[PDB]
Amino acid sequence: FSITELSLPKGGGAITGMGEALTPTGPDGMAALSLPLPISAGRGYAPAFTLNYNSGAGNSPFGLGWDCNVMTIRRRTHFGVPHYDETDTFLGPEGEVLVVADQPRDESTLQGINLGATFTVTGYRSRLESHFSRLEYWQPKTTGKTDFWLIYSPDGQVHLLGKSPQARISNPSQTTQTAQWLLEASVSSRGEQIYYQYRAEDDTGCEADEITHHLQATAQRYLHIVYYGNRTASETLPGLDGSAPSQADWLFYLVFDYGERSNNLKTPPAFSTTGSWLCRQDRFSRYEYGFEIRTRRLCRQVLMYHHLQALDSKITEHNGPTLVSRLILNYDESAIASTLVFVRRVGHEQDGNVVTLPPLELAYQDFSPRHHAHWQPMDVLANFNAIQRWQLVDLKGEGLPGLLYQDKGAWWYRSAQRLGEIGSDAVTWEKMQPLSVIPSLQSNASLVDINGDGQLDWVITGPGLRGYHSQRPDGSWTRFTPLNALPVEYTHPRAQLADLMGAGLSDLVLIGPKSVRLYANTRDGFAKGKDVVQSGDITLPVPGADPRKLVAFSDVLGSGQAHLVEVSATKVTCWPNLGRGRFGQPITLPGFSQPATEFNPAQVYLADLDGSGPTDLIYVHTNRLDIFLNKSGNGFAEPVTLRFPEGLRFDHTCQLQMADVQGLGVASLILSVPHMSPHHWRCDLTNMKPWLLNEMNNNMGVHHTLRYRSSSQFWLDEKAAALTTGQTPVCYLPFPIHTLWQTETEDEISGNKLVTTLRYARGAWDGREREFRGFGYVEQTDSHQLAQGNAPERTPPALTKNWYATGLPVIDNALSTEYWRDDQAFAGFSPRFTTWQDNKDVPLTPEDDNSRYWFNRALKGQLLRSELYGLDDSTNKHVPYTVTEFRSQVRRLQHTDSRYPVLWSSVVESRNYHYERIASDPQCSQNITLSSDRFGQPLKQLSVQYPRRQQPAINLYPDTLPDKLLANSYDDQQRQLRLTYQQSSWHHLTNNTVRVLGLPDSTRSDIFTYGAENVPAGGLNLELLSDKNSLIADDKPREYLGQQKTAYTDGQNTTPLQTPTRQALIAFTETTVFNQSTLSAFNGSIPSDKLSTTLEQAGYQQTNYLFPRTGEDKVWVAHHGYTDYGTAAQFWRPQKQSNTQLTGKITLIWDANYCVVVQTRDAAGLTTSAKYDWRFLTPVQLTDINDNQHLITLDALGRPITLRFWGTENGKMTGYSSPEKASFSPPSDVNAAIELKKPLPVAQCQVYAPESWMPVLSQKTFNRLAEQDWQKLYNARIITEDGRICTLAYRRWVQSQKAIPQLISLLNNGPRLPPHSLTLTTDRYDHDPEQQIRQQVVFSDGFGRLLQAAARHEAGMARQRNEDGSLIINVQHTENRWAVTGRTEYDNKGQPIRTYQPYFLNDWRYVSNDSARQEKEAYADTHVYDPIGREIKVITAKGWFRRTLFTPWFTVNEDENDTAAEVNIDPKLYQKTPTVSVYDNRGLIIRNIDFHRTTANGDPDTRITRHQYDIHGHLNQSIDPRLYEAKQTNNTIKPNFLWQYDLTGNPLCTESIDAGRTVTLNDIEGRPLLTVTATGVIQTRQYETSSLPGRLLSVAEQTPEEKTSRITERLIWAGNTEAEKDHNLAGQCVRHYDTAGVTRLESLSLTGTVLSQSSQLLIDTQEANWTGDNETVWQNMLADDIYTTLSTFDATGALLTQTDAKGNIQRLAYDVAGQLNGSWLTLKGQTEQVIIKSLTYSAAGQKLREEHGNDVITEYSYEPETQRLIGIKTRRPSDTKVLQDLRYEYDPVGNVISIRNDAEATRFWHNQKVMPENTYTYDSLYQLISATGREMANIGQQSHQFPSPALPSDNNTYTNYTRTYTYDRGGNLTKIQHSSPATQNNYTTNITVSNRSNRAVLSTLTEDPAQVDALFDAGGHQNTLISGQNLNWNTRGELQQVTLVKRDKGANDDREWYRYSGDGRRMLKINEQQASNNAQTQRVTYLPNLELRLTQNSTATTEDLQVITVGEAGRAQVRVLHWESGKPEDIDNNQLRYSYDNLIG
Known part of the structure; x- marks a missing residue:
């Protein structure tokens, strides 16, 4: 939940690339790439497509290897062609077999649409459920109607697949036969629709023969248009009736172009086009569905189109749909196979120009046989005699062919074996071994199970076998042939296959690895047999006849x-x-011919050499051989002629075999010659499998390289290694898989490489289902390889060992062995097999072997175990950092079908060990899923945090640890077994028309906490916790943690409903906050009888417990997250939103299509408006609550490029000029933008240069060599259409000659910079003649990370950048100066490994990495990480270093001092004072251990700060070392802090010994309602009403004495009036009454800054009590003086002028980088005089050279390695006098150890010229132990009595002194020893510390610790400064009054009292002296930059003084004294006093 809020995007910054990402896919072992498409999210419901590569993939419409898989559901073809009847099996969209779910039913309608027939609808579900979607098969009972599929998704979606013929793949001959139902349409659950329109294959663009020989090529369907953003809400699938899509009905179109439209960078493609398809060269055909499916098309573009006329009806479209983004896919076209080698995103501007991104280049393993053709003697076969009668074939199914031969009348096989060194790909063959079969017993053409294998795999054909009757019986021997090279129905022939086979087969002569020459037995039935036999309408040649x-x-x-x-x-x-024995009409494959008088079929071999798929044809000559490569099954290319080993003539006695002895999937040439020696030669045409993706380059500074290795080689390694030990491993993978073996990531900018290397073992292959289960063991090794010159501290290789289940117990069971062993670890997990009965899981043992097979199959692919290691030299290198392991559960949901059961696979248990390489003391957590519902949703879950092992004897921790640390790392919080127990309840909507799943209902969390001895076994598991005696049984107690319930609506009525609607509209969320326990925290603060009411008043409600137990009554909850939704016609879009019942709703006003929110109106009516750019649906203009305008613009790619704003200040229009008033075309190249001058009508301007890593060709070089030259360069994609050099293509073009010299030679280093962006930023509005243009340039790397930033600074000294990027340290003056900051160097995992100090440069351009690395004065800190990705070492630039050791239960931090000994005052003192953080088994820091030491040789005191967390995980107690120590002898000592929380973790009660007890109750908005302070004050807060934002309106306070509350604060907020908008006051607290008066807000600026405010103060006699609702009685309590401060700011918000309440005007001036560089003052009536006339800074922005109005110069000096302040010179040039030069010296961590003033003493000290250096010494906790200094002789002993100043007449003197400080163990300063020998004023100040707290007082108040605490009020406020001076305090804890001198008998005291603002600032001070002679009152009023000091008597007002303040105190603040009266004689009026300060000001 979130309240909607409108805002404009930000520009510049990093540079985002294409978003391509390389995927892992461990267990299967493939290389897999994900490449995103430019799909607009639109309204939210949009198509989900990605362009995906996978090394295991074949050809596709997107080239070899790729695909853009749309959701399709299809018939199963794995086991052979489907029969298109009642027996076919169907596959779902993810490839799983579908199973009948429910019994079918009759339906003739669907979603209110009439389907026009009675359909039988059948339920279907996956046989391996995961999503739990439900499928329906709709089959017409009556002919003439088509069948289709529905998918009810579990998230409310409904998908329709294969209803319209446009979206189904069918047999064009018998169109009734449907192969694939493609996704036709889908509809969401809130009225959004998507229609997928495909485009059938046709003859357009194909040439003559293509169309002639491929008839009815219309089957294939291509993806063409996807409509979405439907303009009318509906829950009905579009095009369900059958209509075609009308583009007017939609807002967004995704178009896949296959060559129709124009493909240039000059003009944008058109949505509608008459263009013609392109017919690819690598046309291909697939036949697995029983008929030809022809593919002739390649997708050349992916285009996004918006219906701008519909989104914004003020836009008119003449072309039609408008293009918003474009994706060009350019290929490497070839007749053998086309490869996607270029991908580029492009946008088209309105002016015709294009905006472009760097292209993604891809390269695949090529196949160059001429360069790679070398014959090598097979030295390993010198002892191998047979040359003519032997087969090189993989009989045992290992993945490599062995030697199969016969000798001495016996049969022998020889498996393949590793040759010597493991890891090398060399191959040999082991000692012979007899076959388990006997060929003699076999009949001709007989199936046989070779080598005792269970399955029949091979076919035998020989003369000596029964049934052999060859008509040409010459030179034939017993031969073996693999059953996989023969058609699938060879076993039971049929049709054409049967007729061809006829009587039978004599010989089966392998002529390749997969190609078999055929000889028939003597024919009968067609005894004449004149060549061909006729079958059907096709003439088949009889094999061997001709x-x-x-x-x-x-x-x-x-x-x-x-x-x-x-x-x-x-x-x-x-x-x-065509399957089932069917064979189609013949196709001629042109390209091969031999002279008829010479051609010999025995010289023909068929084998895949190019590895592209189709078999290539080798014809063997005598001295050579011709290699005809196959052009995609469409013919043959011109022959590649290869010579034989010189002096060799191949004849009928030699032998040639085509065999995959490399395991690459391609074949190599195995030659055998009898008469010459060596007898056996070998030609490898390629050592790497071709066509696989092996290189990428995004042309932004990243270069990827892939390397593969055959699974067969890993089999050889596994076999060899496992044969070092006397064991026999079994290979369960009988063929090659070309696994991804190395991924090298190269950062072209930093030079840092990263090589991730993968090993595989235990490959598994299922013979039954003919599937690859995966690799049981996958090993991963990340090795950073940083560039030279970098730090010797690299991150060592990290190694991850992963074990994945295969579902084959023979492997899975044994995987347990390789695991890292720990005799103390818990029992390993075993997979759990259950059956769904009575609505829960029932454990079973799979009944029969079949059930075992399926149950175990489900387990496949799951990660069973992972172990992380660091491969370095540490003594624990063999111990893992972390060890995770997992337990799978397979549930039988359904058993109806006899073939397969329906199973669900889930991970019920997970266990996580953290050893941190300490085998003896690990952490261990473990999550368990106790129960789940039918749809897999969890109902009970348990999180287990185990206790720590009791201290072992063999201490494996390092011996460099501080003494006793390890034992101090133990804590009782580490020895608790913690079981968090979570219950959940869900909502399911399930019927034949609705499927909504996973909807939350309720959740509850309790927690069992058990003693460490209850950890059983062996550990906990699912069963021990589901038992009767379980630790979490229903009778055992448990601490309740909380509960939450989700409240749904139907969209129309308030009352939440019992069962959500398909829309699942969340009305609100109900969350428990309090129970009785947590409510105990208010005892005494809120009376019991008045508690409930109060909570009710705060928004909380009572409700029963969820999942209630016996004896549980009521809890208190808060309802939050209220949404009022629109109508179904509005797509159920949120209209109102409100956080809680206490605040009003904000209103959302959507666009006309309910895509985006165009206006927000908060509960106060404040309006925010947003005009959108509908190319991207991003806001581009904002009208704020003050009716001011904020505008940006975008380029064609969506990036912000200009920002402006304007509006009304003080009722007047001001700001930047609109584009109407003043236009501005933004620059294109960064250089011209930098060369821009004022004025500019923009606040900002961006310029993007992502392609800056690609060199650009000189226009004049373009002229030098042009057109033909350029055209050749460009055609191979070396150059783009624009003059950009493509890095990868150019690379594979340098290593390729025939290019001729590259006159184009700018890739010769030179002008290439990392990706970068410029931001110009104006500091004044355009009509301001002193506007400057700030300039910032940011550099990104190819991964999009920030490298460095350059900011234009005022001219001056700076380092230099060379023409080649070289850094020069020798500084020099320049007018082109740039502060370089943020400079960083990362490794390829994003980790910052080097961080440089800022520096000035004569250029914004990037400095090469090695330049800065090779230079020491480019000061850099080095960072060093561990495999977990944590900093473990930091080597500063100065040499010192910090270090961090991570151990399972504590982390040890050594800082620079702590390690100084291993590389300042006394390194041995800080030796071994690390800060240790000790955790529990919940990751919570329970101890902070320090090591105190004052002298180098003392032994360390151990300081322990202990923190204790309750079983809710909340910080309950904190106790410091001295009270922890004092408590070990008395456990009734209260800890420093004791907290009580609610159930959500909010602090309710805070019991502090120092600050007292503070209670607070917040309302459901999180706002403070009721506070009770430690002194008893009741603070109540009063907010706005339920129809408003809920802002603060009043603060009231009631002391214990006061029987009625006092209103201390009133807030009066602004409205919407046009006057408020004219002053920008909307939503502001315009009138704020606080504790000392009122603050009025009169005018804000466009930058939110205050232009005018005024303070009024209370009359001194009136306490602040604003009662009633009449503001006048309040205004009468004020003093008439109105202190108005008013100022003016620049465009950025920086102060430019300020005018205090007495007319004086401070003026500021800034530089080109926004740094203050001028300060003026104008006193009322006088003329302006400068205060600061010059001010330069350092590269880090620290003050450097300051020239004050008195011509005095201050020069600051900084340590370049650290930027630490080391110098403050203060000199006066009128007489060349150094007034004060302070020099600082720090220790490594930065404590100040020495301060020496190198200036000579002032004229105030008689005959003294030299000032001594100050020295300071610290302990191991950096507490100041000793200090030296100077002091004036007559100071005497120290107290609050301030000295009288020394005068020049007095001839005073200053002596040296030494102070020594003695601190407590709780940090309290107990004693100060001041010793000054010469003066002889030696004293000791003593501080008495309380025995039970940190309250401590000067000894003169008490010496008895037990009496100290009573010298403070209840809240730690010292109520006696010194005996006789009483201290009184506010109700807010602020110092109210000091009684300076008491007086009796009613007389009046000397006192100073204070009045503070509402937020804590002191506004008023009044010092009253009742001395009879002159009763004097001093009054100080504190105002912005002004002080009003007024001194009176009873008779007259002596002094009236104004103190002006220019600057901020502690930073050379300059005060000015102006007198209105009482000026003393001996001081000029308007005196300027310049302050000059030290480090701390």
Whole structure:
């Protein structure tokens, strides 16, 4: 909940990129990228699309690898083509199998629309529920109607998929057969709609042969237009009746363009276009649905269109829908496969110009066989004899092919093995091993389960087998063939497949890894067999009949099925496989031909070499071989000819095999030669799989690099490593997965790299469901690689070990082994299997093996365990930082269907260990889900905080710890078992038409707190806590924490309803705040009989407990978050909003479409208005409550670029000139904007340069080489349409020759800066001739982080930036000066690792990183982090360093002093004084441990400050070291503080020993209602009424004596009158009566500053008691004097002039950076005289050179490493006299240790010239222990008696002195020892501290601690300054009166009394002296920059004095004394007194 508030965006700052993000997806092991589209949120209900990459993905309309998946529901094809009948299975939108839910029913209508037939509707749900959406299948009983799907989502949405033919993929031959129902429309639960219109495939743009050979290519559907922002609310799906969409009915359109529209940067595309589709080169076809689906299109643009004429009816659209944002997708087009290699966001300005972002470049692994073709001898096969009769095939299913051969009449296999070093990809083969089968027993073409595997996987074909009758029986041997290369229905043939197979098959000769040449047995039935056999209407070639023709199975189309292929000497022909034995009409694949007289089919091999999918065709010559690459199953490219190993001639005795010996998925050439040696050679055409994404560059300073490694190589590593130990691991992954193995992130600006390296093991493959379960073990290793010159302190590699369930128990069970072992840890988790019965979970054991299979399957993918380690040299390197582990629960929701059960998988338990590398003393929390409802919502949850282990014997903590610290880290709050117990109740709306899920109803939290011995086992788990004897059983007690209930409305009636409506409108929220317990805090402050009423008056209400227990009555709640909603026709949009029943509602006025709020009217009627820019739906103009205008403008990308404001000050129009009055075209390049001069009619102007990292080509270089040259450069996307150099393309173009020298050579470093933005900021309005233009430039990095900021400063000395970005330290004067601040260097995880001090530069431009790193005087602090991301070390620029050690129960902080010994006064003193923070098992700091030490050799006192938190988690007690010590001997000592809270954590009662007991009750608005102070005063506050904002109106106070209240404060707030607006007083407290008078507000400015106010004071005799409602009786209590202060400010709000209540005028002047640089004063009547005439600053903004009106100069000196103040010279140039040069010296942490004045003494000290250096010494807590100094001789002993000044006549002297300070253990200064030898005035001041508190008094008042506390009032106010001087105090705790001298017998005392403002400022001081000789009254009135001092007697007014103050005290404030009378003779009038101060002023 939040009250709506209108505001305008801010410009400049960081630079946001495309938003692309690289995703992890650990267990599956793929590289996955997310790239967002420019979709407008519109009204709120909009399409959710992202453009996604995944390395495992094939080709798509978005190129190879990507997709833009829309929600589709489709038939299941995994196990083969669907049959389009009652047996097909359906997949939901996320791919899960769908299962019949309910029994079907008959419906002929839907949402009041008539469907025109009786539909049978069937319920469906996922077999692995997650979202819990519900699906419906609507099937017409009567023909002529189409079937469709509904999805009732769990969030009220309803989706319609596949009703209209435009949104379904069907077989164009028999259109009845539906393959995919695509999302057609959807509607929200509040009346918002979305319609998805696709666009079927056609022949437009295709060439002749494409259309000729691909018939009825209309099946494919492409996404074309998405309509949303419906103009008329409705809960009905659009286009349900069947109508097409009308663009006028919508506000927003998302258009996917596939080439129709123009694609240039000069003109914006048009919503409607006659343009023609583009036909891609890599056209492809898919056949898994039983028919061809052709794809010919590539999406070239994604365009957002707004209906501006409808959003703002003052806009007229001639083109049609207007373009608001554009996304260009440019490809690397190829006939083999197109790849998305360029992505760029673009916007079009109104003037035609375009605004652009840096493009995202992407690069994929290319395939260059010519450069990579090298034959290497297979040295490993020298002992391998066989050359002609052996198969290189993966029999055992390991992912790599082994050696399958026969020798000596036996059969032998040889698995693949790692060659030597683990991690290398080298491969060999292990010692032979006999096959588990015997080929002799087998029949011909027989299925067989090789190597004892359960499943039949291979087919055997040989002469010696039964049934072999080959017509050409020459040179054939027993052969094995994988069943996956043959069609799916080979087992039971049918149709064309059956006719082709005919009688049978003789041989099956693998010619590739997946391609099988076919030979048939002697035919019968068609005995003639003249070549072809006829099947249906297709002629099939009989395999082997024609010896001049190859006949084989091979996926020459790259689609996933074993197609039929014939190869003649002249053409390759393909019959595609349509499943069930169906084969389609033949397609000719042009491009391959051999001379008919030479062609030999035995020389043809089919294998995927390019890895693009389709099989490539290798024809083997004698001295070479030709490689025909496949052009997307559309033909073959020109051959790549490869030579053989020199001197080799391939003949019929040699052998060639195409085998994946690399595991890359591509194939390599395995050559075998008998007569030459070595006999076996190997050619790898690529060592990296091609076409996978491997490079990114956002052209903003980030370069990503991906590297993959085959899962098979990880299998080899796993096998080898697991074979070091004598164990046999089983491979459960029988094929390659190209896993993401390294992600390298390179910051091109900082040079910092970050390499994240991934290992995999325990890969799992399900043979039953033919799915990949994932990798059981995934290892991750982040390694920072910072640039050279950086700090030697890097962050060492961080290692995360993750174990994920696979659902295969043989693996999951054993995963427990690799876990890090802890004999003390709790029992590991086992997955829980339950069945849904009687509305709850019932644990079962899965009955049969099938149930086991499914139950375990559900577990797949869940993170079981994660362990974090730091890989450094620490002695705990092998101990994890953190260890998390998880327990899954699988529930059986339904068992009806016999095939699959319906299961829900959830994580019921989670456990979190924090060891921090300390194996002996971990923290452990654990969350459990005890029960949940049918829809998965939790009903009972338990959060477990475990206790600390009792102190072990083997101390694993470091021995460098302070002594006794570890034992002092133990606390009883650490030894409590804490069980937070949360109950929840929900609302579900479920029927055949409604599904709203997860709606909250009620929540309750209690908490069990148990002794540490109750921790069982082995630990707690779901079962021990669900038991009868559980610790959380219903009979065991528990501390109630709170409860909340959500209150819904129907939108029309107030009374909350029992069951929410589909809209789920939240009326309000009911929250418990009090119970009886917490109410005990008001005992004594609010009488019992009067308590309820009071709470009622404050807004609280009584209500029963939720989930009430026996004996619970009532609690007090607050209702908050009230909303009054509009009608359904208004999209149920909020119209009014109100926080509580105590305040009025604010009213929201929406635009005409209920998209945005255009006006707010608060409960007082103050109006805020917002004009929007409907290109983006962002506010761009604001009319404030004072009817003033604030305007901005936006560029075509939505970024603010200009800000103005104007309005009325003092009833007059002022401000910046509107664009009508004065126009201003903002600059485009930062340089010209910087070269701008005054005036400007803007407050601000932004200029964005995101593309500044891309070098730009010289226009004159464009002229130098132009057009043809440029066109070649541009076509390959080296250059953009604008002169931008694309970094990645250029990179892959330098390493590619034939480019010829790059005359274009500005990528040669030079003019490239990080992304940056400029902000110009005017300080005066445009019609002000002294307007300056402030200039700031901010630099971002490619991740969008702030690097540095430059601010134009007044000319002067500054360092220099070279032409190449080099930093030069030697300073020099310049007129182009910039303060550089914020300079930072990050690593690639965003962590700041170097932070530099500010510095002046002669340029705004960025300084190269290595330049600043290589320079020491570029002072930089280094930061050092741990793998958790916490600072652990900081090495300052001066050398010192701080350090932080994190341990599970305490954190140790060593500061610069504490560590000075490891690298000032005495480093051994501060040795081992760290500050320790000791936590409990709730992360709450329960102890602060310090180590006190005064001398280097003393042993440390241990200071313990103990904090105790109640079981609500609230700070209950705090006790300091000395009372903690005193309490160990007497436990009746009250702690320093004792707090009592409510149930939400608000403090109610504060019992302080120092400040007393304070009680406070707030109202449901959070406002103080009733306070009771420690002295007894009752403060009651009175606010506005329930129809108003609820501002403060009165403050009343009632002492215990006063029997009636006194009204101390009245507030009078302004209204809406046009006069108030004319003075900008709306909503302001115009008349404020306080304790000392009234403050009146007369005029505010456009910047909210006060232009005129006036104070009036009470007559001295009247206490402030504003009673009644008549303001005149109040005004009569005032003194007539009106002190009016009035001022004028600049455009930024800075003060320019101020006029005090006596006409004197201070004037200020600022510089080009907003720093004060001038100060003048004009006394009433006199002329203006300067006070400050010059003032320069340091780069950090600290005062530097100040020249006062007396020509005296002050020069400040700063330590460059730290900016610490080290010098204050004060000199007078008229006589070259150094009046006061103070020099400071600090210790490392910054304590002042020495102050020496290098000036010579003043003329006031006789014969004294030298002033001694002051020295100060501290202890380990930095308490001042010793001090030396100088003092005038005649000072004597110190007290409140001020000395008389020394005069030049007296010839006085000053001596040295030493003071020594003795402090308590609670921080109290107990003793001061002043020793001054020469003077001989040695004394000791003693302070008596109370024994039970920190009240302490001067010894002269008492020496007895037990009597000190009674020297203070109840609230710690000392009521006796000194014995005889009584002190009285306000009712607010402010000093009321000092009785300076008492007098008896009714006489009058000497007294000083004070009057303060309502907010605590002293306004009036009156010193009264009743000395008889002259009864003198001094009166001081404190006013803004003015003091009025008036001294009177009973007879006349002696003195009248005005003290003017120029500056703020402590900063060289200059006072001026002006006398209206009583001026003494010996002082000029209007005296100027310039103050000159020290460090602390």
